[PDB]
Amino acid sequence: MELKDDDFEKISELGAGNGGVVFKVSHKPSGLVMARKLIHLEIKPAIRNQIIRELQVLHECNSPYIVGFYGAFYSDGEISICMEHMDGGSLDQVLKKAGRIPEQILGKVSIAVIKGLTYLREKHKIMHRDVKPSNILVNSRGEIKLCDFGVSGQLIDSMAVGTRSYMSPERLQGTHYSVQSDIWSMGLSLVEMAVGRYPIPPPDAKELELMFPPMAIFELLDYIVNEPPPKLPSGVFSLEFQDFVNKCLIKNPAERADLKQLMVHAFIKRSDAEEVDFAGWLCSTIGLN
Amino acid sequence: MELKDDDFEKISELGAGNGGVVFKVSHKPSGLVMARKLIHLEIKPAIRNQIIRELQVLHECNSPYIVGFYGAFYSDGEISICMEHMDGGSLDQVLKKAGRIPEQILGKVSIAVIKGLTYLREKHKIMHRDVKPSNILVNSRGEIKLCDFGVSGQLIDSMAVGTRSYMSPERLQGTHYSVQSDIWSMGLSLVEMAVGRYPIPPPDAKELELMFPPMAIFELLDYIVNEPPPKLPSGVFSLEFQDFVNKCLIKNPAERADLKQLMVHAFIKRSDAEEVDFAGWLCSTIGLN
Ligand SMILES: Nc1ncnc2c1ncn2[C@@H]1O[C@H](COP(=O)(O)OP(=O)(O)OP(=O)(O)O)[C@@H](O)[C@H]1O
Ligand SMILES: Nc1ncnc2c1ncn2[C@@H]1O[C@H](COP(=O)(O)OP(=O)(O)OP(=O)(O)O)[C@@H](O)[C@H]1O
Ligand SMILES: NCCNc1nnc(-c2ccc(F)c(F)c2Nc2ccc(I)cc2F)o1
Ligand SMILES: NCCNc1nnc(-c2ccc(F)c(F)c2Nc2ccc(I)cc2F)o1
Ligand SMILES: [Mg+2]
Ligand SMILES: [Mg+2]
């Protein structure tokens, strides 16, 4: 069934930021609750038909690790992308309430993220381009899924920041980057979730022991590309986790790990085996179940 | 008279970008056409009463070089600032259609900008913080006015980029900046308007003679703060204009000119004297009068 603007009705607001805003909605004809994302774009039909035309591949994106897609349409100065409502929200949201996310949980998250990238890469030849806690969604059935990835070339164009960059050093510096760039973002996202705050600049001995101001725009990006990458603090995280992110956070794209290698790395295999109630931990920490 | 959400009605859309969107509206009770700017802000009453409370000083901002203010209010997840509709739009808009803006015209623009900063500084103790072509408005009565400046401390907080920075080198690097930072932005805005495109990176001999790709985020900001500043191309601009922007675009805030000195600089005095029909040139180039 085709989605239309008038067939919907706002329930509430799930958050926004920079385009760029998302409602919990009701699709009257079907009964389903959906997440509707609105992207404002002043642009000529010609293109904003292409965009819509390029978003249709999302119908073909089926994976337990990819947020489900229902349809996209254009409606007075806004293109709308409708997706599965994930009632757990985004990892950036759960991190606030959680203070920190435990190593075992991030292990399950890492497995999800890696299987998603891999799926998008092998079956569709696409890089995510914007991996970070807020583009990782979770639900009460314990599922972990990626959204907001780079399906639309024309949309990639018609968009191209902030105060916190998850962009790899290479991508920050020039046109010479690609899929390996997603690994860096994942690395940084995990060190963030493991530690409770954006890991750059790294915490000093003082803050370190306490846990266990803003930076200027150039100050930040200059650090990322010219200083050593962040590390998981030692002692309080398995040595396997530490090696995993370290393999992720290597400044040189070709030296950095890729999906193949990360898929068979100690921390994955160990996390793969482990028995955890993510659904349980999630609702426990955010009050839902 | 107080402004309320229901007393308005949309006429059309004047543009948007990053917050951040503006309608030509009709204030039913009064009959006036206004520009209504909507800023989305998920935040607690406590503050978004302060913000509104801090925007009231705009009522006290009266100057032929400052965009007129009618009122601000909050309405379901958006704070609204209502201003004089300027039927000429923004200098970034006129630049597209104009290809280039003539030296004589920029001279009048420079006088306006400088008198505005000066007004905000002397009578209200405030820096603009976001001077660039799109925050300079013009109308058919030939008036040139600044908007979007930093009245609200809490709003300054509750906001803190792109692909084109008009931020001074010092502001890009740290907390150690202030009003002198607006001079840099003005300098760069004029070199942009004089030349027809964002002046960084500077044009090569080839493009230079032809007139007469995107950069990466770090590539750009790194250039700004570590390479020489842009210059007006020689030969085709008065030597006084050249000295004016050069005095503006000096990387060191304390060495850079200030408003006092720019106010009595050759190019100003010369532009001050000159007789030009800005109202005429404006409508001519954008089809209005
Ligand atoms: N399918 C969904 N189900 C549930 N919540 C969602 C869904 N999609 C988005 N959201 C919520 O909406 C918020 C805003 O999404 P959006 O992609 O516009 O911004 P963001 O990714 O958080 O930040 P940025 O836009 O700066 O990258 C997200 O943080 C998430 O909490
Ligand atoms: N008072 C006004 N009268 C006429 N047009 C206006 C007025 N205020 C804003 N506009 C138009 O609305 C557009 C969007 O304004 P807004 O401040 O949201 O974005 P911007 O300043 O262009 O870019 P950015 O938000 O990236 O700084 C402006 O470019 C301008 O053309
Ligand atoms: N303030 C910026 C908001 N962040 C963002 N939201 N959607 C995207 C996005 C970008 C490129 C693209 F091609 C998409 F399909 C995109 N959307 C998208 C892709 C897949 C799914 I499943 C759901 C989506 F919303 O980027
Ligand atoms: N996408 C970002 C949009 N750019 C922007 N629009 N308004 C502002 C602004 C910022 C700080 C502030 F304190 C204001 F009053 C502000 N608004 C404001 C101030 C004076 C006048 I006269 C009119 C205004 F809209 O910044
Ligand atoms: Mg997102
Ligand atoms: Mg503006």
> CATH no. for residue B28?
3.30.200.20
Cα–Cα distance list, A278 to A32, A233, B99 (Å): 25, 24, 58
Partners of residue B78 on adjacent β-strands: B40
Find out whether the peptide bond into B201 is cis, omega within 30 degrees of 0: yes
Residue A215's nearest CA partner among A235, A198, A195, A232 is A198
Cα–Cα distance, A174 to B218 (Å, whole number): 8
**What is the experimental method?**
X-ray
Domain containing A10: what range?
Answer: 1-86
Cα–Cα distance, B121 to B126 (Å, whole number): 5
> Domain check: are A54 and A95 in the same one?
no
Cα–Cα distance, A215 to A115 (Å, whole number): 34
Residue A175 DSSP class? S
Q: Where does a domain end: A86, A117, A138?
A: A86
Cα–Cα distance list, A17 to B51, B59, B266 (Å): 19, 30, 46
Residues sharing a CB contact under 8 Å with residue A33, sequence separation 6 or more, in sequence order: A11, A24, A25, A26, A27, A85
> Domain check: are A195 and A279 in the same one?
yes
| B274, B104 Cβ separation under 8 angstroms | yes
Q: At B257, give phi and psi (nearest 5°).
A: -65, 160
Cα–Cα distance, A32 to A69 (Å, whole number): 12
Cα–Cα distance, B128 to B182 (Å, whole number): 7
Residues sharing a CB contact under 8 Å with residue B256, sequence separation 6 or more, in sequence order: B180, B183, B184, B247, B248, B249, B250
* CB nearest to B77's CB, from A13, A165, A213: A13
CA of A135 to the centre of ligand 5 (A): 5
> Domain check: are B77 and B207 in the same one?
no
> Domain check: are B131 and B260 in the same one?
yes
Q: Where does a domain end: A86, A119, A149?
A: A86
CB-count exposure of residue B263 (10 Å: 0-12, 13-18, 19+): middle
Residues of chain A contacting B174 with CB distance shorter than 8 Å: 216, 219
* CB nearest to A221's CB, from B40, B77, B221: B221
Q: Which helix (H) or strand (E) is A141 found in, with range?
A: none
> Domain check: are B93 and B119 in the same one?
yes
Determine the 3-state secondary structure of A264 from DSSP. Answer: coil
Residue A32's nearest CA partner among A6, A58, A70, A61 is A70
**CB neighbourhood size of A155 (10 A):** 21
Q: Residue with structure tokens 């998302």? A: A22
CB contact under 8 A, B222 and A222: yes
Specify the resolution in Å: 2.6
Mutation to test the B interface, candidates A161, A217, A219, A227, most B Cβ within 10 Å: A217
> Domain check: are B137 and B178 in the same one?
yes
Determine the 3-state secondary structure of B21 from DSSP. Answer: strand
Ligand (nearest to CA of A79):
3
Residue B82 DSSP class? E
Residue B109 DSSP class? H
* CB nearest to A214's CB, from B18, B77, B160: B160
Q: Which two tokens stand for residue A26?
A: 């009701």
Q: At A221, give phi and psi (nearest 5°).
A: -70, -25
Residues sharing a CB contact under 8 Å with residue B123, sequence separation 6 or more, in sequence order: none
Residues 148-167 of B with CB under 8 A from A: 160-163, 165, 167
Q: Please report the atom of ligand 4 found closest to the CA of residue B152.
A: 13
| A221, A172 Cβ separation under 8 angstroms | yes
**CATH classification of the domain holding B122:** 1.10.510.10
Burial of A180-193, coded b for 16+ CB within 10 Å and e otherwise, reads bbbbbbbbbbbbbb
Residue B169's nearest CA partner among B242, B231, B246, B221 is B221
Ligand (nearest to CA of A89):
1
> Domain check: are A11 and A127 in the same one?
no
Q: Where does a domain end: A86, A118, A146?
A: A86
Q: Is B15 annotated for ligand binding?
A: yes
Residue A74's nearest CA partner among A14, A161, A152, A160 is A152
Domain tally for chain A? Answer: 2
| B174, A219 Cβ separation under 8 angstroms | yes
φ/ψ bin of B196: left (φ > 0), alpha (ψ from -120 to 50), beta (otherwise): left
For ligand 4, atom 20, which residue shows the shortest CA distance? B148
> Domain check: are A149 and A259 in the same one?
yes
CB-count exposure of residue A160 (10 Å: 0-12, 13-18, 19+): exposed
> Domain check: are B251 and B289 in the same one?
yes
> Domain check: are A21 and A96 in the same one?
no
Q: DSSP strand E in A102-193: where?
A: 136-138, 144-146
For ligand 3, atom 16, which residue shows the shortest CA distance? A148
Tell me, rounded to whole angstroms, the distance of Cα A134 from its chain centroid. 5
Q: Which two tokens stand for residue B97?
A: 């259609």
Cα–Cα distance list, B257 to B129, B184, B226, B262 (Å): 17, 9, 20, 6
Helix H segments across chain B? 47-55, 91-98, 103-124, 153-157, 169-173, 180-195, 205-211, 217-226, 239-248, 259-262, 266-273, 278-286
> Domain check: are A27 and A68 in the same one?
yes
> Domain check: are B182 and B272 in the same one?
yes
